[PDB]
Amino acid sequence: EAIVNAQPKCNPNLHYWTTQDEGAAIGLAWIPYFGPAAEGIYIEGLMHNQDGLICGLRQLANETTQALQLFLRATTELRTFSILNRKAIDFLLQRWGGTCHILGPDCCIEPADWTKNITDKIDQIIHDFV
Amino acid sequence: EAIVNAQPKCNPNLHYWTTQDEGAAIGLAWIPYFGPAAEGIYIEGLMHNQDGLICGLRQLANETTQALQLFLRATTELRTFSILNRKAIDFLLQRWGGTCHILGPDCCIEPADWTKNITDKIDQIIHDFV
Amino acid sequence: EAIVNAQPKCNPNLHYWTTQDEGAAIGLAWIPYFGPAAEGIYIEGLMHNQDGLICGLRQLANETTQALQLFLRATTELRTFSILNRKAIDFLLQRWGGTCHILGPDCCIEPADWTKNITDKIDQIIHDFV
Amino acid sequence: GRSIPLGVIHNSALQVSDVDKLVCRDKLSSTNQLRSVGLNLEGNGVATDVPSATKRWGFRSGVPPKVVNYEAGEWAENCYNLEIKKPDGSECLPAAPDGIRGFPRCRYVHKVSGTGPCAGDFAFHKEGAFFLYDRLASTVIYRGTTFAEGVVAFLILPQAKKSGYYSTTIRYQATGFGTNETEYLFEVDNLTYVQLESRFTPQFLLQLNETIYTSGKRSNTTGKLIWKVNPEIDTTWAFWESEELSFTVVXXXXXXXX
Amino acid sequence: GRSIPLGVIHNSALQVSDVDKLVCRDKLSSTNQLRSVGLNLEGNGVATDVPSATKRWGFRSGVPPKVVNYEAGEWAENCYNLEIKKPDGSECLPAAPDGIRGFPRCRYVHKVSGTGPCAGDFAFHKEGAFFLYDRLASTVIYRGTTFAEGVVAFLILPQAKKSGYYSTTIRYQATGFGTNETEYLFEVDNLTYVQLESRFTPQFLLQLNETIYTSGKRSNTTGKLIWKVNPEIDTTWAFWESEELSFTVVXXXXXXXX
Amino acid sequence: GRSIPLGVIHNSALQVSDVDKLVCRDKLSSTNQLRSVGLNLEGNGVATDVPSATKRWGFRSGVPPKVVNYEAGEWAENCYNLEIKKPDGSECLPAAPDGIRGFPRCRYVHKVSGTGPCAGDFAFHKEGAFFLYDRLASTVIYRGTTFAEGVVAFLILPQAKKSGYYSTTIRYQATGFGTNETEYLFEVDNLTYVQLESRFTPQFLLQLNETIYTSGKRSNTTGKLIWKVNPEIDTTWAFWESEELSFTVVXXXXXXXX
Ligand SMILES: *[C@@H]1O[C@H](CO)[C@@H](O[C@@H]2O[C@H](CO)[C@@H](O[C@@H]3O[C@H](CO[C@H]4O[C@H](CO)[C@@H](O)[C@H](O)[C@@H]4O)[C@@H](O)[C@H](O[C@H]4O[C@H](CO)[C@@H](O)[C@H](O)[C@@H]4O)[C@@H]3O)[C@H](O)[C@H]2NC(C)=O)[C@H](O)[C@H]1NC(C)=O
Ligand SMILES: *[C@@H]1O[C@H](CO)[C@@H](O[C@@H]2O[C@H](CO)[C@@H](O[C@@H]3O[C@H](CO[C@H]4O[C@H](CO)[C@@H](O)[C@H](O)[C@@H]4O)[C@@H](O)[C@H](O[C@H]4O[C@H](CO)[C@@H](O)[C@H](O)[C@@H]4O)[C@@H]3O)[C@H](O)[C@H]2NC(C)=O)[C@H](O)[C@H]1NC(C)=O
Ligand SMILES: *[C@@H]1O[C@H](CO)[C@@H](O[C@@H]2O[C@H](CO)[C@@H](O[C@@H]3O[C@H](CO[C@H]4O[C@H](CO)[C@@H](O)[C@H](O)[C@@H]4O)[C@@H](O)[C@H](O[C@H]4O[C@H](CO)[C@@H](O)[C@H](O)[C@@H]4O)[C@@H]3O)[C@H](O)[C@H]2NC(C)=O)[C@H](O)[C@H]1NC(C)=O
Ligand SMILES: Cc1n[nH]c(-c2ccc(OCC[N@H+]3CC[C@@H](C(N)=O)CC3)cc2O)c1-c1ccc(Cl)cc1
Ligand SMILES: Cc1n[nH]c(-c2ccc(OCC[N@H+]3CC[C@@H](C(N)=O)CC3)cc2O)c1-c1ccc(Cl)cc1
Ligand SMILES: Cc1n[nH]c(-c2ccc(OCC[N@H+]3CC[C@@H](C(N)=O)CC3)cc2O)c1-c1ccc(Cl)cc1
Ligand SMILES: Cc1n[nH]c(-c2ccc(OCC[N@H+]3CC[C@@H](C(N)=O)CC3)cc2O)c1-c1ccc(Cl)cc1
Ligand SMILES: Cc1n[nH]c(-c2ccc(OCC[N@H+]3CC[C@@H](C(N)=O)CC3)cc2O)c1-c1ccc(Cl)cc1
Ligand SMILES: Cc1n[nH]c(-c2ccc(OCC[N@H+]3CC[C@@H](C(N)=O)CC3)cc2O)c1-c1ccc(Cl)cc1
Ligand SMILES: *[C@@H]1O[C@H](CO)[C@@H](O)[C@H](O)[C@H]1NC(C)=O
Ligand SMILES: *[C@@H]1O[C@H](CO)[C@@H](O)[C@H](O)[C@H]1NC(C)=O
Ligand SMILES: *[C@@H]1O[C@H](CO)[C@@H](O)[C@H](O)[C@H]1NC(C)=O
Ligand SMILES: *[C@@H]1O[C@H](CO)[C@@H](O)[C@H](O)[C@H]1NC(C)=O
Ligand SMILES: *[C@@H]1O[C@H](CO)[C@@H](O)[C@H](O)[C@H]1NC(C)=O
Ligand SMILES: *[C@@H]1O[C@H](CO)[C@@H](O)[C@H](O)[C@H]1NC(C)=O
Ligand SMILES: *[C@@H]1O[C@H](CO)[C@@H](O)[C@H](O)[C@H]1NC(C)=O
Ligand SMILES: *[C@@H]1O[C@H](CO)[C@@H](O)[C@H](O)[C@H]1NC(C)=O
Ligand SMILES: *[C@@H]1O[C@H](CO)[C@@H](O)[C@H](O)[C@H]1NC(C)=O
Ligand SMILES: *[C@@H]1O[C@H](CO)[C@@H](O)[C@H](O)[C@H]1NC(C)=O
Ligand SMILES: *[C@@H]1O[C@H](CO)[C@@H](O)[C@H](O)[C@H]1NC(C)=O
Ligand SMILES: *[C@@H]1O[C@H](CO)[C@@H](O)[C@H](O)[C@H]1NC(C)=O
Ligand SMILES: *[C@@H]1O[C@H](CO)[C@@H](O)[C@H](O)[C@H]1NC(C)=O
Ligand SMILES: *[C@@H]1O[C@H](CO)[C@@H](O)[C@H](O)[C@H]1NC(C)=O
Ligand SMILES: *[C@@H]1O[C@H](CO)[C@@H](O)[C@H](O)[C@H]1NC(C)=O
């Protein structure tokens, strides 16, 4: 489905905070004893509403709430960290959880080059047939 | 292996309780503030002993206990939630953890249609050979 | 990359402890009520420096520390048990997270026997062409 | 060590297997096909009366407790809820950890309060079974928290597929809990008790309680009244398959005959 | 029940989907392509003043709290920090669990201290939103812990891709918290207060606080001084888009006119 | 940030790599091929005496502790167990969290009790190493809980593959712990002590303790006796590769010469 923002307003700019994913540490800063405190581990960024992604994202989070709250109601874990790992597992099972029938719509195997490897060898025996 | 119930008795009917997996909420019932308490989140069901599945299931749970208890003895997690996710991962690694040799017994790739795509094109060049 | 031990010394022998992975229990020893206490669940082993693996392993653990400590700084989990499961997931996504182009370098599908199944049937119609 | 077995349906029958021992025609398309379930020892024919059940549990030190979750369970006829102290007043069982609630479907909740030596840090199941709580299974018993005895199984489901709730609490007093010389009393009120027998069923206890209230055989004294039941009265096979009494009085003991 | 939706970019637009509803050309090559993010209710146009915001929260018993993590968040203009007790002195909110810290980017932290009946074990969001802490989102409010109201989304990222921090604390006193008759006071010092209105913006409160300090209109008495603001003074649309006052005095009430 | 490296065997040698940098001929058929292991700093040649080891640890506030599990470890010659208080009596170290037990294989357990300023909420490893407990590794030190210093590695194993336990506790008293002016005493009994030197090995301390008991050089007084050891006595390279003493006495100090 597509995403229709139906909120009273939208802030089209996203000024965000997170932790750093790339780049090695500088000197001893990676050692907990010498490194920053809890308040100083964050980086910042800013993204604008290209392709309407920011206002779409605000509506997506809003629409996610019902299903997420029903999932939390049914789990007995006090703190849930496994949602994204389970999504990755379900991605793989959807494509590779059964037998992959080549050329079928549910099998992500491309033998396009595999044909040109065999259809180029049509003239490996049919043409050098002296 | 097959499952042999070796218990003194078997209750052949299973009257069960669980949480609901399908169907959207009604109105505001999904909001924790308005929704049911811990005692009212359950649904019920009843299944009979078709194909002997109920008495087989009672024996299966009994036979699972030794291996499950030895796993719990060896883990340092206080509460274990990851058994089924690890089974799913091991399912995928067994079939796709190495190179898939087509036509081999350990490779779940079917090129049956892939043959009839190429064996129908036997008469794409061998027969229009004017 | 290869591993260069750059430590002041290396103990070339590894006298280790762990829990048992294989073999069924003896009698009632699997029952928590009758089994060993926390101090008696361990097995021991000894491995020597064949192929330089022990001194390489000491250097590997040393070099792992920076990236591991930066990961722990960024997580909000109090106790982290999921590192190896996530490695397994990333192994599968790297090879099967997209369309597998047969004969390509990133696709682990071997059709070597699949050729000899079709290249043996070159003389299934080109030779019995009476 | 051993691999945790997995249930799968083949040739119209349940079989034990594992993810490594499946053929290519077996299909797993989402984590929703995997399920963990808890089955009650009740369904295997075990005796469920309080004297028989408590003999399956014992105290032991040196073993850390462990917990595993399960997603669905079975309605129980008999559950148990324990408040045991040492004679010096100290608690024998630990308080329930955060997020662990009582088993959610119990027709009868046998609530036992009393004393015993409790020679061990935790109480375990002597046969290796689990104590089932609200979608969490533990190896030990928690204080004042309703549980059922049971075991856990793990399943792969196939691709395709093909009254209210009443609960009654039955209260007991106990001495010498967890030993060879345990004695039990069924509680009619705070001053009227019945000496317990293994042969007494739940509905026999409930109807015996009713006749006592309606015949006026409760204590009318500051002191405690304990009724005994002679062998030749009748008492109500497994659970899924009056005017006649006479009361004479001899703390204060007495006898109920037919 | 429902499946947790997943955001994906197709045809230069964000769409909702799930891992089971993707075509073969969509590629997921590592868990690093998946992200969980928290978006603030601020960005949707909700009123953020203390009187309006507190009406979205309420107390309820019988529902266990739940927590879910998120990896990245949005800088907030308004956050909240609550210290509410019952009139008998007991705390209304639970202490923050181990490892849960305050939201890390707040331009204004509205710190409310006061009393109310607190008819419930936990305080929830009446509209089903979450209380956002430091990369953990909870369904309930923790005592003295800075939070922002928000919601969570889950994304798959494509293969390719294409000033300092200031925080100011604004303190309030409250009576009848969480009811229909709540009254609020903005705190200038421990003895000088301003009766709060929904129309007061943060910067209006900060500049009103400045004029009071610089005009010498603080209390010079053991007693408490409370200023009221007549309707016809002006007060500073959403957040992303002086000499003139006169003070006369009538506890002790007073009025500030233009 | 950085990717956590992974050990793999190629061309008869261990190499660092990752799951994204493997060729198709590398095979991973189950999660049992992946392992996490803990290696002791001992095996790299670090000094293990109490004065040298404690200088690698220090107190720091503002950093939340973190824990990661590991599946197998190495037998240790030296472990440590700390009971440090401030001079005002308050504890410097936190009690061990639920489920964290001491390291399970220690030939010598150096148990240090004493006082220090402890200028920080938690004690960390100054070189970024971990404190290894029972299959859990932590960034901080827990009170009265035996640990070894070490680091963690992660491995992929190939498809194919190709005496009892004694522990001795050595007790110490310390003042000025965690500073530049720390002083240590080896404890013979509650009233007889030996001034500690970095050059003293474990077996030298154990045999020095034996000669004191067998020569009758313990205190025979209410007061405390402290022996000093002159430089020219001999003391027992890494760990894997008597009648002659004379005691003269000068609290109460003394000297042991050869
Ligand atoms: C899965 O399902 C199986 C089968 O249903 C269960 O098997 C039970 O296993 C337990 C052991 O854990 C058995 O209990 C033991 O029974 C012994 C025999 O009992 C008989 O003995 C007398 C004298 O011969 C008979 O007259 C009488 O009929 C009894 O029935 C007892 O001797 C044992 O008690 C002694 O040993 C224990 C230590 O184990 C001591 O603590 C006792 O004090 C005593 O000295 C013991 O009670 C039980 O009989 C088995 N059942 C069946 C039907 O075979 C598994 O338990 C089950 N798994 C799980 C996890 O539930
Ligand atoms: C995702 O995004 C959507 C859209 O932005 C949000 O939708 C909001 O949903 C809440 C309900 O949870 C709505 O709140 C309710 O509004 C009702 C109507 O308010 C108007 O009513 C008067 C009289 O007609 C109007 O004059 C005035 O303009 C008001 O605006 C109220 O009647 C409701 O209050 C009553 O019911 C509640 C119980 O729900 C009682 O507790 C109250 O005491 C009272 O009796 C209620 O306040 C809100 O209006 C919706 N917004 C919009 C823009 O439609 C979702 O909440 C959001 N999801 C998440 C998770 O954030
Ligand atoms: C992986 O393996 C490597 C190699 O074995 C380890 O490397 C060690 O890293 C630590 C730093 O974390 C080094 O410790 C530092 O050594 C400096 C040099 O020490 C020498 O200095 C004097 C004067 O020159 C020499 O005469 C003498 O021989 C010393 O050996 C010290 O100057 C440092 O101390 C100063 O800085 C620290 C702050 O870091 C202050 O707290 C101190 O008070 C002091 O001011 C410091 O001690 C160590 O030398 C390295 N070893 C080697 C062999 O190179 C990694 O630590 C290891 N990783 C893990 C996780 O274990
Ligand atoms: C006879 C029968 N038919 N169906 C079931 C059944 C089993 C489990 C179940 O779990 C639903 C919760 N759900 C939560 C999250 C989901 C996720 N993966 O996110 C997955 C799980 C629902 C069911 O209807 C049973 C059954 C069998 C044995 C016993 Cl003891 C009790 C019941
Ligand atoms: C938890 C749960 N949910 N749903 C089921 C379930 C039960 C029976 C079942 O049988 C139908 C197979 N049927 C397929 C088509 C035909 C064909 N020729 O294939 C004929 C055969 C399929 C199911 O999915 C279970 C379940 C309950 C108990 C146990 Cl022990 C195991 C599973
Ligand atoms: C506009 C934008 N561009 N980029 C991001 C972004 C999002 C998440 C992010 O997470 C990095 C932490 N990292 C830790 C461990 C990693 C692992 N899997 O190990 C994975 C995650 C880093 C980012 O830069 C955003 C963004 C969008 C919405 C909001 Cl509300 C805030 C920011
Ligand atoms: C968290 C994060 N990190 N990075 C991104 C990201 C943003 C935009 C994006 O657009 C580029 C696509 N671009 C590819 C090449 C061209 C082609 N023809 O394919 C033209 C199109 C790609 C990204 O990876 C996000 C992100 C942020 C907000 C939201 Cl809502 C979703 C994702
Ligand atoms: C030299 C050597 N040979 N073999 C091992 C070894 C390593 C780990 C190991 O773990 C077994 C626990 N097991 C529990 C659950 C299992 C699951 N995935 O369920 C998986 C793990 C068993 C071992 O024998 C070592 C070794 C190497 C370095 C060090 Cl420091 C110590 C020992
Ligand atoms: C934890 C663990 N369990 N088992 C092993 C193990 C050790 C050595 C090993 O070497 C044999 C390879 N051998 C295969 C056949 C031949 C061929 N031509 O392939 C010749 C080569 C294989 C193993 O599985 C380890 C382990 C211990 C330390 C370290 Cl550092 C890494 C792994
Ligand atoms: C594929 O084509 C190459 C030439 O580009 C050829 O060398 C190779 O043999 C072909 N593949 C097979 C399986 O024959
Ligand atoms: C497979 O068969 C279809 C006709 O059904 C044909 O159009 C197509 O080209 C064939 N596949 C290839 C790779 O040629
Ligand atoms: C592969 O070769 C076998 C003979 O070894 C033959 O029977 C079979 O038909 C071949 N495969 C196909 C798809 O024809
Ligand atoms: C407990 O059982 C009997 C009491 O019925 C008693 O005689 C016996 O000695 C006791 N058992 C032990 C091991 O002391
Ligand atoms: C019986 O005793 C319990 C506590 O021992 C008490 O709470 C209860 O009120 C008493 N019942 C009656 C009827 O007094
Ligand atoms: C016993 O009978 C009385 C009288 O009706 C009733 O109130 C009480 O609940 C009964 N006890 C039980 C345990 O059902
Ligand atoms: C008083 O109690 C006795 C038994 O203790 C009972 O038989 C008698 O009926 C009671 N009194 C009345 C008036 O019921
Ligand atoms: C709360 O709201 C008004 C006060 O403004 C009051 O009249 C009303 O009765 C109260 N609501 C309820 C449900 O009592
Ligand atoms: C105001 O009161 C708080 C506690 O009620 C106190 O901590 C603070 O010091 C007081 N402020 C002044 C300026 O006295
Ligand atoms: C109010 O003004 C005084 C005077 O400068 C200042 O010290 C105080 O911090 C201000 N209060 C707030 C909440 O900014
Ligand atoms: C004393 O307080 C009053 C208001 O309560 C204020 O108007 C007056 O200016 C203050 N005194 C001085 C000297 O500022
Ligand atoms: C600690 O080290 C020496 C004591 O040996 C002392 O002179 C020095 O001043 C101290 N270091 C600092 C930073 O004060
Ligand atoms: C030494 O002191 C400790 C406590 O300081 C005490 O527990 C121990 O019994 C004492 N040892 C002797 C031999 O008295
Ligand atoms: C010191 O020697 C005595 C005498 O045998 C012994 O009892 C004691 O355990 C020894 N101390 C240590 C730490 O081994
Ligand atoms: C008494 O202690 C002294 C040292 O303090 C020691 O030399 C002497 O031998 C002890 N007495 C006996 C009888 O051993």
Helices marked H in chain E:
50-54, 202-215
- Ligand 4 centroid to residue D155 C-alpha, Å: 10
Four-CA torsion E121, E126, E128, E131, nearest 10 degrees: -60
How many residues are present in chain D? 258
Q: Which residues of B touch C24 (CB under 8 A)?
A: 66
Strand segments, DSSP code E, in D27-118 are 34-40, 57-60, 67-69, 73-74, 76-85, 106-115
Nearest to F61 by CA among D99, A33, E232: A33
The helix (run of H) or strand (run of E) holding residue C45 is: strand C42-47
Q: What are phi and psi of D197, to 5 degrees?
A: -125, 150
Atom of ligand 8 nearest to the CA of C43: 24
Report whether E225 contacts E194 (CB < 8 A).
Answer: no
Report whether E82 contacts E109 (CB < 8 A).
Answer: no
Look at ligand 17, atom 5, and give the residue with the nearest C-alpha.
E180
Look at ligand 2, atom 61, and give the residue with the nearest C-alpha.
E129
Report whether F187 contacts F226 (CB < 8 A).
Answer: no
Residue B29: how many CB atoms within 10 A of its CB? 12
Cross-chain CB nearest to C102 (options A41, A92, A114): A114
Look at ligand 6, atom 4, and give the residue with the nearest C-alpha.
A45
Q: How far apart are CA A19 and CA A45, in angstroms?
A: 11
Amino acid at D234: D
- Is the shortest distance between the CB of C75 and ligand 12 below 6 Å? no
For C10-19, b/e burial (b = at least 16 CB within 10 A) is bbbebebbbb
List chain F gaps (C–N > 2.5 A) by preceding residue.
162, 236, 241, 250
D139 Cβ partners below 8 Å, 6+ apart?
B69, B72, C32, D63, D65, D66, D67, D124, D125, D130, D131
Q: What are phi and psi of F217, to 5 degrees?
A: -105, 20
Q: How far apart are CA E129 and CA E56, in angstroms?
A: 9
Q: Which residues of E touch D29 (CB under 8 A)?
A: 20
Strand segments, DSSP code E, in chain F are 6-10, 13-17, 34-40, 57-60, 67-69, 73-74, 76-85, 106-115, 122-125, 130-132, 136-138, 148-156, 168-175, 183-189, 192-195, 225-229, 246-249, 252-257
Q: Are strands D122-125 and D57-60 parallel, antiparallel or unpaired?
A: antiparallel
| 3-state SS class at F252 | strand
Nearest to F169 by CA among F212, F108, F83, F80: F108
Strand segments, DSSP code E, in E157-191 are 168-175, 183-189
| 3-state SS class at D172 | strand
Quick one: D250 exposed, middle or buried, by C-beta within 10 A (0-12, 13-18, 19+)?
Answer: exposed
Ligand 3 site, CB within 6 A: A 28; C 6-8, 62, 65; F 126-129, 151
Q: What are phi and psi of F174, to 5 degrees?
A: -140, 145
**Per-residue CA distances from F184 to A95, E52, F139, F217, F234 (Å):** 65, 63, 25, 20, 20
Nearest to E139 by CA among E119, E152, E120, E124: E124
Return the structure tokens found at E9: 């970019």
Q: Are strands C109-110 and D148-156 parallel, antiparallel or unpaired?
A: unpaired
The domains of chain C are located at 1-80
Report whether E252 contacts E223 (CB < 8 A).
Answer: yes
- Asked if C52 is an interface residue toward chain B (Cβ–Cβ < 8 A), one would say no
Report whether D182 contacts D176 (CB < 8 A).
Answer: yes
Q: What are phi and psi of D54, to 5 degrees?
A: -65, -25
- Is the shortest distance between the CB of D128 and ligand 1 below 6 Å? yes
Q: What are phi and psi of F147, to 5 degrees?
A: -140, 160
Nearest to A14 by CA among F143, D173, E74, E181: E74
For D65-74, b/e burial (b = at least 16 CB within 10 A) is bbbbbbbbbb
E27 Cβ partners below 8 Å, 6+ apart?
C97, C98, C99, E159
DSSP F139-160: SBPPTT--BEEEEEEEEE--SS
Strand segments, DSSP code E, in chain D are 6-10, 13-17, 34-40, 57-60, 67-69, 73-74, 76-85, 106-115, 122-125, 130-132, 136-138, 148-156, 168-175, 183-189, 192-195, 225-229, 246-249, 252-257
Strand segments, DSSP code E, in F28-87 are 34-40, 57-60, 67-69, 73-74, 76-85
The helix (run of H) or strand (run of E) holding residue E124 is: strand E122-125
What is the chain C residue with the closest CA to D126? Answer: C33
Report whether F199 contacts F167 (CB < 8 A).
Answer: no
Cross-chain CB nearest to C97 (options E27, E135, E136): E27
Q: How far apart are CA B88 and CA A93, in angstroms?
A: 8
Q: Do F99 and D20 touch (CB under 8 A)?
A: no
Q: Which residues of B touch F27 (CB under 8 A)?
A: 97-99
Report whether C87 contacts A97 (CB < 8 A).
Answer: no
3-state secondary structure chain A: CECCCCCCCCCCCEEEEEECCCCCCCCCCCCCCCCCCHHHCEEEEEECCHHHHHHHHHHHHHHHHHHHHHHHHHCCCCEECCHHHHHHHHHHHHHHCCCEECCCCCCCEECHHHHHHHCCHHHHCCCCCC
Report whether E105 contacts E199 (CB < 8 A).
Answer: no
Amino acid at F175: T
Q: How far apart are CA E73 and CA E77, in angstroms?
A: 13
F195 Cβ partners below 8 Å, 6+ apart?
F183, F184, F185, F186, F226, F227, F228, F229
- Ligand 22 centroid to residue B8 C-alpha, Å: 58
Q: How far apart are CA F244 and CA F234, in angstroms?
A: 11
Report whether E191 contacts E202 (CB < 8 A).
Answer: no
The helix (run of H) or strand (run of E) holding residue C72 is: helix C53-74
| 3-state SS class at E86 | coil
Rg (CA), chain E: 22
Residue D239: how many CB atoms within 10 A of its CB? 15
Nearest to D249 by CA among D220, D224, D223, D225: D225
- Is the shortest distance between the CB of D180 and ligand 13 below 6 Å? yes
| 3-state SS class at E167 | coil
Nearest to B109 by CA among A96, C101, F207, D107: A96
Nearest to F175 by CA among F250, F87, F110: F87
Solved using: X-ray
Quick one: F197 exposed, middle or buried, by C-beta within 10 A (0-12, 13-18, 19+)?
Answer: middle
- Ligand 14 centroid to residue D102 C-alpha, Å: 22
Q: What are phi and psi of E207, to 5 degrees?
A: -80, -35
DSSP assignment, residue C68?
H
Report whether E196 contacts E182 (CB < 8 A).
Answer: no
Resolution value, angstrom units: 2.3
| 3-state SS class at C83 | helix
Q: How far apart are CA D193 and CA F97, in angstroms?
A: 45
Q: How far apart are CA C33 and CA D140, in angstroms?
A: 10
Quick one: D173 exposed, middle or buried, by C-beta within 10 A (0-12, 13-18, 19+)?
Answer: middle
Which residues on neighbouring strands pair with residue F195, listed in sequence order?
F185
Nearest to F103 by CA among F40, F54, F56, F155: F40
B110 Cβ partners below 8 Å, 6+ apart?
A99, A100, A101, A102
Four-CA torsion C11, C16, C21, C23, nearest 10 degrees: 110
For E201-236, b/e burial (b = at least 16 CB within 10 A) is ebebbeebbeebeeeebebeeeeebbbebeeeeeee
Rg (CA), chain C: 26
Q: Do C32 and D58 touch (CB under 8 A)?
A: no
Alpha carbons within 13 angstroms on the beta-carbon side of residue A82 total 23
Quick one: A84 exposed, middle or buried, by C-beta within 10 A (0-12, 13-18, 19+)?
Answer: buried
Residue E25: how many CB atoms within 10 A of its CB? 9
- Ligand 6 centroid to residue D177 C-alpha, Å: 57
Residue C65: how many CB atoms within 10 A of its CB? 19
Q: How far apart are CA F93 and CA D182, in angstroms?
A: 45
Cross-chain CB nearest to E72 (options A18, A39, A60): A18
Residue F112: how many CB atoms within 10 A of its CB? 19
**Per-residue CA distances from E211 to E246, E256, F189 (Å):** 11, 11, 72
Atom of ligand 23 nearest to the CA of F210: 2
Nearest to E196 by CA among E53, E66, E17, E30: E53
Pocket-testing residue among C113, C119, C121, C124, ligand 12, by greatest number of atoms within 8 A of Cβ: C121
Q: Sort residue E62 into left (φ over 0), alpha (ψ -120 to 50) or beta.
A: left
Atom of ligand 13 nearest to the CA of D179: 1
Q: How far apart are CA E148 and CA E137, in angstroms?
A: 10
- Ligand 17 centroid to residue E124 C-alpha, Å: 20
Report whether F144 contacts F91 (CB < 8 A).
Answer: no
| 3-state SS class at E140 | strand
Report whether F179 contacts F116 (CB < 8 A).
Answer: yes
Report whether C90 contacts A90 (CB < 8 A).
Answer: no
Q: How far apart are CA F112 and CA F107, in angstroms?
A: 16
B130 Cβ partners below 8 Å, 6+ apart?
none
- Ligand 17 centroid to residue E59 C-alpha, Å: 16
What is the chain B residue with the closest CA to C89? Answer: B89
Q: Are strands E136-138 and E130-132 parallel, antiparallel or unpaired?
A: antiparallel
Report whether B102 contacts B111 (CB < 8 A).
Answer: yes
Rg (CA), chain D: 22
DSSP F177-201: TTSTT-EEEEEEETTEEEE--TT--
Cross-chain CB nearest to F64 (options E29, E30, E99): E99
Amino acid at D162: K
| 3-state SS class at B122 | helix
CA E123 to chain centre: 14
**Per-residue CA distances from E201 to E47, E103, E186, E258, F69 (Å):** 10, 21, 12, 18, 49
Q: Which ligand is nearest to the CA of B29?
A: 2
**Per-residue CA distances from F179 to F51, F118, F126 (Å):** 11, 9, 13
Return the structure tokens found at E40: 């603030």
**Per-residue CA distances from F29 to B67, D26, D237, E62 (Å):** 21, 18, 49, 46
Amino acid at D133: Y
A57 Cβ partners below 8 Å, 6+ apart?
A14, E7, E14, E37, E39, E153, E155
DSSP C102-122: TTSTT--EE-HHHHHHHSSGG
Q: How far apart are CA D105 and CA D163, in angstroms?
A: 13
Q: How far apart are CA F213 and CA F190, in angstroms?
A: 13
